[PDB]
Amino acid sequence: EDLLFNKVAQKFNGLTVLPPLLT
Amino acid sequence: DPQTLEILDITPCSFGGVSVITPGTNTSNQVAVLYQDVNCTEVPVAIH
Numbered sequence: 001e002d003l004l005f006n007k008v009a010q011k012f013n014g015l016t017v018l019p020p021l022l023t
Numbered sequence: 024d025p026q027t028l029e030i031l032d033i034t035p036c037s038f039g040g041v042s043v044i045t046p047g048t049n050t051s052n053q054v055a056v057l058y059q060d061v062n063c064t065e066v067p068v069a070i071h
């Protein structure tokens with residue numbers, strides 16, 4: 001799972017990036 | 024700056040959404056308010 005995570009909230013003109021419920 | 028020649032960032036002043044967490048209206052009339060993507064240092068300064 002470490003390889004799969006190392007192989008793959010920005011303010012802008014009204015754009016929002018909500019976080020996922022399950023971290 | 025057209026005088027001192029300093030490099031100044033430009034960051035938009037916080038916006039976001041407001042979400043009301045309701046226990047129910049059939050259970051209680053209390054609410055909690057979520058200010059998304061906003062530091063609490065800036066929540067009280069707003070209109071309405």
Ligand SMILES: *[C@@H]1O[C@H](CO)[C@@H](O)[C@H](O)[C@H]1NC(C)=O
Pocket residue numbers: 062063064
């Ligand atoms: C939010 O405000 C607190 C109070 O100064 C600060 O310590 C924290 O770094 C701020 N959060 C961000 C993401 O800047």
